[PDB]
Amino acid sequence: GSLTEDGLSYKEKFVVRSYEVGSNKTATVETIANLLQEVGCNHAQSVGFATTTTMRKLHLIWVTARMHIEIYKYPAWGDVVEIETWCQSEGRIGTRRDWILKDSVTGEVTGRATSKWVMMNQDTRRLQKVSDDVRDEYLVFCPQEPRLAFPEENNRSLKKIPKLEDPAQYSMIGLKPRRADLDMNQHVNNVTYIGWVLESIPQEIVDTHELQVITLDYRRECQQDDVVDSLTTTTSDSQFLHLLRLSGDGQEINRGTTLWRKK
Amino acid sequence: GSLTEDGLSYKEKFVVRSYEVGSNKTATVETIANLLQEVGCNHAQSVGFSATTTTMRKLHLIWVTARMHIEIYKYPAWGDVVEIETWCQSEGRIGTRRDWILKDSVTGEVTGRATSKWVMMNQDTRRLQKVSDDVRDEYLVFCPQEPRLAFPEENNRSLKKIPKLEDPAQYSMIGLKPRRADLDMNQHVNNVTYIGWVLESIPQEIVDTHELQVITLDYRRECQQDDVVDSLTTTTSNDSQFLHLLRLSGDGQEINRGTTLWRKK
Numbered sequence: 001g002s003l004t005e006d007g008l009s010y011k012e013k014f015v016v017r018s019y020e021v022g023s024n025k026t027a028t029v030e031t032i033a034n035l036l037q038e039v040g041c042n043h044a045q046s047v048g049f050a051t052t053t054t055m056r057k058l059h060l061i062w063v064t065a066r067m068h069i070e071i072y073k074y075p076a077w078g079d080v081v082e083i084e085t086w087c088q089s090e091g092r093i094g095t096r097r098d099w100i101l102k103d104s105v106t107g108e109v110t111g112r113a114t115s116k117w118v119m120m121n122q123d124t125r126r127l128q129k130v131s132d133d134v135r136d137e138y139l140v141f142c143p144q145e146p147r148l149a150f151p152e153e154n155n156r157s158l159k160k161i162p163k164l165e166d167p168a169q170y171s172m173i174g175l176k177p178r179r180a181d182l183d184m185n186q187h188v189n190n191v192t193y194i195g196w197v198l199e200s201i202p203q204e205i206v207d208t209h210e211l212q213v214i215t216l217d218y219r220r221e222c223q224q225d226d227v228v229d230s231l232t233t234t235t236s237d238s239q240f241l242h243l244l245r246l247s248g249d250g251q252e253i254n255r256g257t258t259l260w261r262k263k
Numbered sequence: 264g265s266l267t268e269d270g271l272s273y274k275e276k277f278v279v280r281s282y283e284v285g286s287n288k289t290a291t292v293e294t295i296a297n298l299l300q301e302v303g304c305n306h307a308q309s310v311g312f313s314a315t316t317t318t319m320r321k322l323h324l325i326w327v328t329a330r331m332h333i334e335i336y337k338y339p340a341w342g343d344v345v346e347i348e349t350w351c352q353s354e355g356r357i358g359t360r361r362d363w364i365l366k367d368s369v370t371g372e373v374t375g376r377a378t379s380k381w382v383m384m385n386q387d388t389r390r391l392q393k394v395s396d397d398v399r400d401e402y403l404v405f406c407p408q409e410p411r412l413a414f415p416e417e418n419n420r421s422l423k424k425i426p427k428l429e430d431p432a433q434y435s436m437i438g439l440k441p442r443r444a445d446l447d448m449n450q451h452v453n454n455v456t457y458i459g460w461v462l463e464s465i466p467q468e469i470v471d472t473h474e475l476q477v478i479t480l481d482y483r484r485e486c487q488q489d490d491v492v493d494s495l496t497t498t499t500s501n502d503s504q505f506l507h508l509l510r511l512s513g514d515g516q517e518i519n520r521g522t523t524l525w526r527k528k
């Protein structure tokens with residue numbers, strides 16, 4: 001793993017592991033989501049840093065608000081996948097982190113991802129109003145000209161997601177996170193929400209289709225002692241609408257869309 | 264990753280990842296269990312397997328774990344390189360044993376060790392049987408002939424009998440279901456998920472004030488993707504020892520049993 005020549009992006013190679021692949025001997029979308037997360041932590045570490053150095057005097061952390069992933073080819077077990085990552089300021093809204101996934105043998109793009117991050121107080125949760133000016137210490141680690149993984153005007157990564165209406169077509173109820181679903185700070189890692197969203201997708205769709213696009217909006221965090229319900233409705237390639245909510249009160253924690261192609 | 268000079272063992276280095284560590288910034292026992300599993304698959308691949316042979320596939324026979332014993336001294340920190348050496352050995356007609364040695368890549372010292380007992384089984388009927396003569400001769404060429412034990416001790420805890428947890432249990436984690444990330448390429452529940460399920464009944468205070476030293480786990484029945492599981496725990500004992508029992512919620516069928524040993528940080 002290493003920063004590129006200009007220092008405005010980071011690169012890392014990953015050999016696909018045996019337990020990381022699904023029933024078709026290619027890495028799962030959760031494995032890919034974990035690799036995007038790993039290369040982001042090593043990029044933060046290489047430039048001197050979910051927690052991040054500075055802004056900790058105000059008890060300020062970066063939280064994900066949206067994660068959009070689009071895969072063309074899932075890497076096979078044993079293959080090397082190279083991931084390039086970078087960040088970019090979006091004015092007073094927050095930060096955007098993009099990823100490009102390539103095959104290490106061909107050098108061809110096999111996937112791409114984008115995320116929207118926002119500044120939040122780690123104690124009062126919610127958000128301490130994301131709008132900072134003297135936080136210009138991140139502009140030195142970002143490319144100045146726009147560099148977008150999803151550049152096209154009117155693309156899937158910026159479309160509004162509606163709220164799943166009751167009743168849902170499919171549902172996976174009573175989901176609880178175990179100690180392997182928590183990070184070093186004991187919060188549920190964002191990849192577990194992706195796994196929970198896919199639990200409501202019927203087995204037949206997973207066996208006859210491959211996941212092409214997955215857009216996920218983060219609204220609330222699920223605690224280690226909370227129980228979750230996963231809801232799904234076919235909206236259409238097969239398209240779906242998703243809703244994660246707390247099994248009791250029905251408090252919304254997540255919402256999203258998935259797009260699937262026939263194998 | 265590569266086989267050693269003699270071809271009777273395999274070695275592989277692993278950099279510890281951010282999501283692989285727990286609250287102490289060191290790899291979890293489930294992460295370690297996954298690395299032991301990964302190095303075993305790469306050792307099977309390096310000697311021409313996929314770990315069945317043309318003889319085992321002809322009879323619809325597969326290898327299944329019966330016991331997994333892991334003992335950790337130091338858990339590798341996030342960013343550190345851990346080298347794992349693995350090898351197999353015939354145990355007559357009972358089956359095979361696979362041992363592991365974990366070392367620090369900077370110091371070269373043993374930081375952990377593991378052992379497992381594997382048995383021959385028809386993948387369709389689930390019936391166990393003693394290893395046949397013509398099958399055993401196909402593995403002897405990939406195993407050291409003289410004994411090579413990770414746990415050589417005269418009375419090591421890796422061969423001790425595990426009793427059945429009596430009701431009522433002291434602690435319990437009820438209603439555990441495996442998701443699609445808990446399944447392997449053949450859609451069976453990954454052996455490592457049972458370790459995570461066993462540790463779910465351990466109270467949070469014990470995890471926060473202690474570190475896991477030893478974990479012995481016996482596999483009796485496999486859990487299907489649609490089964491619900493109950494995890495039971497009772498303190499049997501500085502060091503805290505526990506007795507564990509994984510059983511199906513629907514009718515209480517025993518699937519797993521084991522013991523864990525913990526020391527104060």
Ligand SMILES: Nc1nc2c(Cl)cccc2s1
Nearest residue numbers: 043044087095138141142
């Ligand atoms: N908010 C930002 N975080 C980062 C990191 Cl972690 C690495 C490089 C650039 C930036 S801009």
Ligand SMILES: Nc1nc2c(Cl)cccc2s1
Nearest residue numbers: 306307314351359402405
């Ligand atoms: N049963 C056995 N399987 C193996 C494998 Cl997979 C590698 C090396 C030695 C042996 S003996």
